[PDB]
Amino acid sequence: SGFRKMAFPSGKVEGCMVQVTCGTTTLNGLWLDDVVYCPRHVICTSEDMLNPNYEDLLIRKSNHNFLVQAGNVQLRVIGHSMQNCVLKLKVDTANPKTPKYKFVRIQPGQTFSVLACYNGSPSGVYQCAMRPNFTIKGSFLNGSCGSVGFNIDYDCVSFCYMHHYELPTGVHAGTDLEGNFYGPFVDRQTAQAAGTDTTITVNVLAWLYAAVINGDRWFLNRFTTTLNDFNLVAMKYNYEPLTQDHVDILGPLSAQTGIAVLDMCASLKELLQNGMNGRTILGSALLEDEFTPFDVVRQCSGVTF
Amino acid sequence: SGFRKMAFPSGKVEGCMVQVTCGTTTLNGLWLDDVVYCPRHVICTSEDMLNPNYEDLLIRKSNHNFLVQAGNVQLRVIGHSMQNCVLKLKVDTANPKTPKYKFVRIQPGQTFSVLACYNGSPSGVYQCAMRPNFTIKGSFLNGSCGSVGFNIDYDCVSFCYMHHYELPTGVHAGTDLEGNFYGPFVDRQTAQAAGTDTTITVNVLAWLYAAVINGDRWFLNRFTTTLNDFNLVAMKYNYEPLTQDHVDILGPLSAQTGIAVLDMCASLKELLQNGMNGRTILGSALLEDEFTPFDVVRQCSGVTF
Ligand SMILES: *C(=N)[C@H](C[C@@H]1CCNC1=O)NC(=O)[C@@H]1[C@@H]2[C@H](CN1C(=O)[C@@H](NC(=O)C(F)(F)F)C(C)(C)C)C2(C)C
Ligand SMILES: *C(=N)[C@H](C[C@@H]1CCNC1=O)NC(=O)[C@@H]1[C@@H]2[C@H](CN1C(=O)[C@@H](NC(=O)C(F)(F)F)C(C)(C)C)C2(C)C
C-alpha cells in the first residue's frame, strides 16, 4: 500500500553529468559517448542574455574556451556545434559510464524524473509532468541549467528534457536533447507568457484508480455517464477533453479494479461539481494530475529496472 | 524557484542492492563490504509468519540455504548471524561499489530517501518522514522488504531505515540497520497499533519558510506571539510543542527571509484557528510537515553531493 510521488533511480544518469564553463558562466552538461550536450546560453555574459545573437557569440569561441569537467578530471573539447538551443561539444573521450539511451520528445501530460544538478554534481531527484502549456513545475536555482529529465525502460534511459528557463510565474521551460524548446519559449532574459494551463484529465482518473486500489473509495458513486456528458462538464472546469484513446489507455486500471472508465468519470464529475467537503484522497485535499496511468501501474504493481 | 518533494540521488545506494532468497521467499538485501543485511523474516514460510520463533527457524538453516544474488552474479555465503530483526550474511566478496557509509538511528520528524526495490533491483525513489509514532507513509508491495532509507552528506551515505512491515492502516514500519524497530512493532503477521500521530510543528514552520522564499506570502501577518502562547494553541490541534532547540534550528531560514520565528508562529496560529479557506500554499491545500529545516535549506539554496 501507499502511493507517493516516486522518481526513477538516478544512478545511470548521475554518471553522465558534467560541468561546463565558458568564460565566467558555469552550468551542467550531459556526457554521452564522446559528446557533451549543454544549453547554448553557457556562452553568454550577463549583458548578452537580455537579447543574444547566439551565432555571433559562438563565432567568437574556439574549443579551448570550453572547460568541461567530470569530477576532478578535465575533458579536452575537440569540436563544437550549435543544434537549435543546445551546444554539442565533441570530446576526446567516450564516457565509460554511458548507459543505453535515446532522445525522445515527450507529449504534454507525460511525466519524467528530473535530476537537478549544480556544477555538474547531482543535488536531488523529483517527478514532473509536462503541463498542457509545455511548462513544468520544477525546483531549479542558478546553475541548474543542463539538468535533464528522463524515463527508464528496463536498462534504457530516454532523455526527454533539458532545463533552460524559469518564467516570471516561477514555473519552468526547457528543450528536448536536440535543443528544440517545448512550448513557445526562447532562450532570452525577457518575460514570456505560457498558455492558460489545463488539468490533465486522464491523469486525474489514473490517480482516482490509485486511490481505489489503496482503499480510498468514498468518492465512488453508483451513477454513470457518457463520454460526451463528461466532456461537457470537463470543458467547464478547465479539464482536457477525454478521448477514446484515453479510455483505452486507462484499460489496465479499469481491469485491475473492475470499475469501468465511464463509471469513474461519473465519480470525477460529482467531485468537480461538489468539491471534496474537506475530505482527502491519498492524503491530498485536491485532485492530482501529475500521475500517468503507467505511473500508477508501475507503482501499484512494482515495475523494476 | 519551485519547491518539490525531492529525494537524494540514489546511485550510491543502487550499487549496494542485492536479492536474498531463502527457500521460496525472496526479498532485498544491502551489500556493504563483505556483509549483506536483510530482514530476518526471509527465513519464514507463510505459516511461520503468523507467530515465528526466529531463533528456532534460523537454527534449521545453513549458509547454502541463503541465495544471494547481485545482478546475474551469485555471492557465496560463508556465515550468518541474527542481530535483533536483521540477518547479517557474511559473503566471500566485498562489494566493490561500497560507498562511504554509516548506520544511524533517526529521530521522529526527520526525513530520508527510500529506494524501493524488488528482487534486488531498484524500482523508484521518494522522500519520507519518520512520524512521531514511528511509522512512515511509504509505497511498498510484496518483495519490498530489504529496501532501505538513507541520507547523504557529500559522499557519505547514512543508512537509517530498512523496510519490514505494513500496518493495517496501510502505513509502514521497519528497523535501523542494527535491526531494532522504530516504534512498538514486531515482525509477525498480526494487527499492530501505532500511537496517535502528531503533526511535526518545526517542519510546518520550515515549509512556511519555503513558501515565503517562493513568493507565497498571503498567510503572513504583522502580528507576533510568544512561544508559550503558540504552544497552547498547538496542543489543541495535536501539534508537537515547539522548543527553543526548534527555534534555533529554524535560525538559518529566519535569517534568509528576515522573518522572525515567532512572527511565523503567529501566521501558523491564524492558519490553524481559521483554516486555509480553500486557498493553497506551494500547491498544497493543507499544511505539510514532512520537510525539515535542512530539507528546505538544501533545496532553496542547492546543496550538491
Ligand atoms: C539556468 N541555469 C537558469 C535557470 C533559472 C535560474 C533561476 N531559476 C531557474 O530555473 N537559466 C536562466 O537563468 C535563464 C537564462 C537567462 C535568463 N534565464 C532565466 O531563467 C530568467 N528568466 C527570465 O528572464 C524571466 F523571468 F523573465 F522569465 C531568470 C530571471 C534568471 C529566472 C537565459 C539565457 C534565458
Ligand atoms: C516485505 N517484503 C513485506 C512488506 C509489505 C507487503 C505489503 N506491503 C508491505 O509493505 N512485509 C510483510 O509482508 C510483513 C512480513 C509478514 C507480514 N507482513 C506484513 O506487513 C503484513 N501486515 C500485517 O500482518 C498487518 F497488517 F496486520 F500489520 C501484511 C498483511 C502482509 C501486509 C511479516 C513477517 C511481518
Numbering used by the authors:
A (entry chain B), B (entry chain A): 1 to 305
Question: Can you list sentences taken from the study reporting this PDB entry?
Answer:
Mpro is a cysteine protease that mediates the cleavage of viral polyproteins during viral replication and is a high-profile antiviral drug target. The SARS-CoV-2 main protease (Mpro) is the drug target of Pfizer’s oral drug nirmatrelvir. The emergence of SARS-CoV-2 variants with mutations in Mpro raised the alarm of potential drug resistance. The X-ray crystal structures of the representative Mpro mutants S144A, S144L, M165Y, E166Q, H172Y, and Q192T with and/or without GC-376/nirmatrelvir provide a structural explanation for the drug resistance.
